[PDB]
Amino acid sequence: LIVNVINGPNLGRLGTTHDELVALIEREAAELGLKAVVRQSDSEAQLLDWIHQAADAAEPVILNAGGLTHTSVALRNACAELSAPLIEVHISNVHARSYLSPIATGVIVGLGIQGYLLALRYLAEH
Amino acid sequence: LIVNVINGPNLGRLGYGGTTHDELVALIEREAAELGLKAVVRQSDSEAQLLDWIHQAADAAEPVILNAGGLTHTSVALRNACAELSAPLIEVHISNVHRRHSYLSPIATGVIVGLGIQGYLLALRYLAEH
Structure with missing residues (x-):
């Protein structure tokens, strides 16, 4: 039910803007x-x-980090504690140019902001 | 219009899936139809x-959703071939491959790994609205 983006x-x-x-x-998320x-x-x-x-609750996570994507062992460690699904999302394509990817259930890169809405759709159906 | 998978x-x-292939x-x-x-x-x-x-697909200018197997990691040919693609190429794997290096990913528009057979349908869904 509850998802953490x-x-x-x-x-x-x-x-796009914040917000x-x-x-x-x-x-x-609602529509789903x-x-x-x-x-x-x-x-x-x-x-x-x-x-x-999220780990303490067992509530699914959609994670995107910029600068702490390819530098943070701490973020890897906390994500190892996640009980419920963890989908790594990236807007840009990092591959033309990650810590979490072996701890993420799945990853989505290079599909813009729609990456977020696709991740959701997975979690919902799952 | 047409999506090559x-x-x-x-x-x-x-x-893996x-689910079987058929x-x-x-x-x-x-x-695909409903999209x-x-x-x-x-x-x-x-x-x-x-x-x-x-x-x-390159000659036709159509989008591809590619899931190579073991060629995805080993094959230069496949990147030159994919490097011809004008319209989107979404690379899809059923398992989470992170095999951690994939030839296609630096020239693929985007990638989807470790979401089962649903990556295909999520890939289709990006192409629909893009």
Whole structure:
């Protein structure tokens, strides 16, 4: 039922606005039949807290981090504790140019912001 | 209009998806219709055959949803072949491959790994609205 869409460093900046996407994500979540706490931050500590909560709750996560994607063992460790599904999403294509991918259930890269809404659809059907 | 969905070596020997190929091939076509597309769902172990299908889609300017098998990691040919694609190419794997390096991913528009046979349908769904 409850899904956590967590976003990281250099995503508060982010062709969409803060909060086009949250609104895009939230209603689509609704249309699918879920609730998407959409959360953003620029610090790992804030980030890690939300991951532990999801693990403590067993509530699915949609994670995108920018700068802590390919640098953070801490973020990998917390994500290892996640009981319920973890879908890594990326808007840009990182492969032309990750820590979590061996701990993520699945990954989506390079499909814009619709990556988020596709991840949802998986979780819902699953 | 037309979406080419191609499958590489060993993918007809499913039985990964839980679901078999024949089942898979119908479902994709099934879910393609409701999105408003004609899923031309193919497979072969022949690398030559695959590459042809890549050329076909390149000449036609059609989007591809590619799931190579073991060629996805090993084959230069397949990247040159994919490097010809003008319209989108979505790379799809049923398992989560993170095999951690894939030739196609740096020239694929996007990738979907570890979401089962549903990656195909999520890939279709990006093409519909893009």
